[PDB]
């Protein structure tokens, strides 16, 4: 009981939900990466390496992935979303660091926030899908 154009919308909506779920999966892995960075930071401090004190920043270079993953989450929230020492390698050793100030809690907060936003988007799409099917049943 559906228009050709209603099929096209429902299909694109379901495909968008698919992309949003994959983005949430990516986000959960960013949370693991952040956890891995925190744990590697705690290990370097526990090892008693000269100069590697509790003031050590500890930001891992791979955490820049979190920055671009976050931007892709913002993209998918727009409706145009149709288109050296191994213990410290990669680790930022600045003390009282400010470019990475508070990275552990802030990056955790961003990524967890993106999961909630992406899940909200999925729910809006399920609501809209139910609305289209409601419109076609009313015309039926
Ligand atoms: Zn730093």
Numbering used by the authors: 322 to 404, 443 to 499
What is written in the article reporting this PDB entry?
COMPASS is a multi-subunit complex in which the catalytic unit, SET1, is required for H3K4 methylation. An important subunit known to regulate SET1 methyltransferase activity is the CxxC zinc finger protein 1 (Cfp1). Cfp1 binds to COMPASS and is critical to maintain high level of H3K4me3 in cells but the mechanisms underlying its stimulatory activity is poorly understood.
To confirm this, we solved the crystal structure of Cfp1 RID at 2.3 Å. As defined by the electron density map, Cfp1 RID domain comprises residues 322–508, with one molecule in the asymmetric unit. This region of Cfp1 forms a three α-helix bundle with one Zn2+ atom binding site. The metal binding site is formed by two loops (referred to as L1 and L2). L1 is located at the C-terminus of α1 while L2 is located between α2 and α3. Therefore, these observations suggest that the ZnF of Cfp1 RID is a novel type of ZnF. However, mutation of the residues forming both motifs and Tyr380 severely impede the binding of RbBP5 to Cfp1.
